Amino acid sequence: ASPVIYQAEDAIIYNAILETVNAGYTGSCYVNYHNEVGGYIEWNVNAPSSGSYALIFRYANGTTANRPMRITVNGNIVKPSMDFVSTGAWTTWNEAGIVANLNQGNNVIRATAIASDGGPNVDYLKVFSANAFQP
Numbered sequence: 622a623s624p625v626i627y628q629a630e631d632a633i634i635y636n637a638i639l640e641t642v643n644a645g646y647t648g649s650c651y652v653n654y655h656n657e658v659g660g661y662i663e664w665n666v667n668a669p670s671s672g673s674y675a676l677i678f679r680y681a682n683g684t685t686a687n688r689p690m691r692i693t694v695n696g697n698i699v700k701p702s703m704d705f706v707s708t709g710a711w712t713t714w715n716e717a718g719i720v721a722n723l724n725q726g727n728n729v730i731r732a733t734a735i736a737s738d739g740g741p742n743v744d745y746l747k748v749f750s751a752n753a754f755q756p
């Protein structure tokens with residue numbers, strides 16, 4: 622199966638907004654976190670079969686400082702501190718990814734901002750099967 626893109630507009634967001642300010646996003650918009658601890662973006666992600674999947678965030682970080690996020694799958698912490706390092710400009714969009722085990726059906730995937738400047742700007746979450754890799 623082709624990778625599935627979970628667009629910004631389809632997320633459940635908390636202390637974050639959907640905006641269009643910085644060029645280079647895809648689809649209708651991207652998420653801009655409030656500049657505070659604890660904002661999050663959450664998607665309901667389908668897994669056709671149980672197994673290992675790549676979860677890739679397309680993101681921008683126009684500050685020099687890492688904007689780490691806590692990644693949970695169904696509330697389970699799979700990455701306590703996932704790095705979202707500077708991309709240099711707010712219009713430069715890079716990828717940051719992890720491999721995680723998902724269950725057949727829905728998986729609740731959340732990225733929560735750890736530090737006080739909030740999370741990176743997030744364009745989408747891209748999900749594809751990565752059975753060759755093992756979390």
Ligand SMILES: O=C(O)C1=C[C@H](O)[C@@H](O)[C@@H](O[C@@H]2[C@H](O)[C@@H](O)[C@@H](O)O[C@@H]2C(=O)O)O1
Binds near residue numbers: 653654656711742
């Ligand atoms: O998260 C940010 O720090 C951030 C996200 C925006 O997408 C950027 O354009 C940039 O905006 C800042 C600031 O947060 C915003 O409130 C407004 O004052 O514009 C600023 C800017 O640098 O243009 O930063």
Ligand SMILES: [Ca+2]
Binds near residue numbers: 654656739741
């Ligand atoms: Ca922000």
